[PDB]
């Protein structure tokens, strides 16, 4: 099984935000998970005497 | 009626529709305009949806 | 010119004063005719609510109106709210009635 | 919740509150109806022109006509657009016959190809008009 392909379960002095991205894809990571909402435009037009 | 934008609503139950889009979890459209001298709402939706009920 | 503040978590709504601070729905007010003319369906439902029983009165300046008479008997009971709010109801941006 | 797609892809207790009143009494004079009607008219995005432009196999798209010709060309449907918009018999605002010299005008059509060469034979019958010279076939 490739060690070096999850290195953040294998190495242990290794943070959980690393990765050596341009050299070799590591397939075990932390991901960051959210749920925004989105509103329509809304408006309340008043009048200027 | 809902205090924030002066908006009237026939069924009280559905307001909390109305206020999610000020931001408030009460418990389609893409732009809501009021007019404060008269009662005429305005309302858009996309161009391919539906019968077109009285919207924008 | 004239913004609303709605008042969440059982604050009290504020209307900003034109000198720059912002007052609740009590207390005395002054209003030209035309303010509450552009703005006669939002005026009315954000404060018929606390004229008709809170603390607010308001002197809406005019110049001259035609005024209309109603006679009533003094031994009896008499409420002038259902005029007073058909007036306010029918007031437009182009038109008051007496 | 999924949302459908536009175009096609390439797998394929309590009291009424003495202040609300429900009963309309003023009637705009610029009219709300009128406004929107010719808003929604001018909202009305632009028009492509992909007139030139190559298609998926390399040949590009249009009619074989003459540049100048087709700009003449589709200022004369541009005025028959506007008599019909205007719903006259004649349009006041033309885009031809201005009275302004412009025969040096050029508008894009089929003719031309991105090698600036004529398009008379489709580029895709050009290529395989010129690999085929090159094929040698099972010795005899
Ligand atoms: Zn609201």
Redesign the interface.
């Known amino acids: 099984i490739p060690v070096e392909r999850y290195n953040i379960l294998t190495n242990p002095d290794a943070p959980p935000t690393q990765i050596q991205l341009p050299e070799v894809v590591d397939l075990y990571n932390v991901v960051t998970r959210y749920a925004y909402e989105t509103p329509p435009i809304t408006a309340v037009v008043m009048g200027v005497p | ?1 809902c ?4 908006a ?1 609503l026939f069924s ?1 139950l559905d307001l909390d529709a109305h206020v ?5 979890h009460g418990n389609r ?12 709402p305005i309302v858009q939706v996309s161009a ?1 949806v539906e019968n077109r009920k009285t919207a ?1 | 010119d004239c913004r609303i503040s709605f008042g969440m978590n059982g604050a009290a709504p504020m209307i900003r004063d034109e000198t720059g601070m912002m007052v609740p729905f009590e207390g005395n007010w002054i209003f030209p005719l035309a303010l509450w003319q552009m703005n006669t369906r939002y005026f009315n439902q954000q404060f018929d609510a606390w004229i008709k029983t809170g603390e607010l009165r308001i002197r809406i300046e005019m110049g001259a109106y035609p005024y209309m008479l109603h006679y009533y008997d003094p031994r009896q009971y008499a409420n002038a709210w259902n005029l007073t709010s058909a007036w306010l109801e029918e007031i437009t941006p182009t038109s008051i009635p007496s | 919740k999924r949302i459908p797609r536009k175009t096609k892809g390439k797998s394929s207790p309590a009291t009424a509150e003495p202040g609300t009143s429900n009963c309309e009494h003023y009637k705009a004079r610029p009219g709300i109806a009128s406004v929107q009607k010719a808003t929604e008219s001018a909202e009305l995005p632009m028009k492509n022109n992909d007139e030139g432009t190559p298609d998926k196999r390399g040949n590009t798209k249009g009619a074989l006509v003459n540049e100048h010709v087709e700009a003449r060309d589709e200022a004369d449907d541009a005025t028959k657009k506007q008599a019909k918009d205007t719903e006259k018999a004649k349009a006041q605002v033309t885009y031809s016959d201005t009275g302004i010299n412009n025969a040096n005008e050029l508008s894009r059509s089929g003719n031309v190809d991105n090698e600036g060469g004529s398009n008379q034979k489709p580029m895709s019958t050009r290529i395989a008009e010129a690999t085929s010279a090159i094929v040698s076939k099972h010795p005899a």
Do not use: K, R, Y
């Not at chain 2, 999610?20 to 408030?24: C, F, M, P, R, Y």
């Not at chain 2, 459209?29 to 005429?40: L, V």
């Open positions: 009626q205090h924030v934008c002066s009237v009280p999610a889009s000020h931001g408030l459209h893409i732009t809501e305009f009021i007019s404060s001298w008269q009662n005429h391919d924008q």
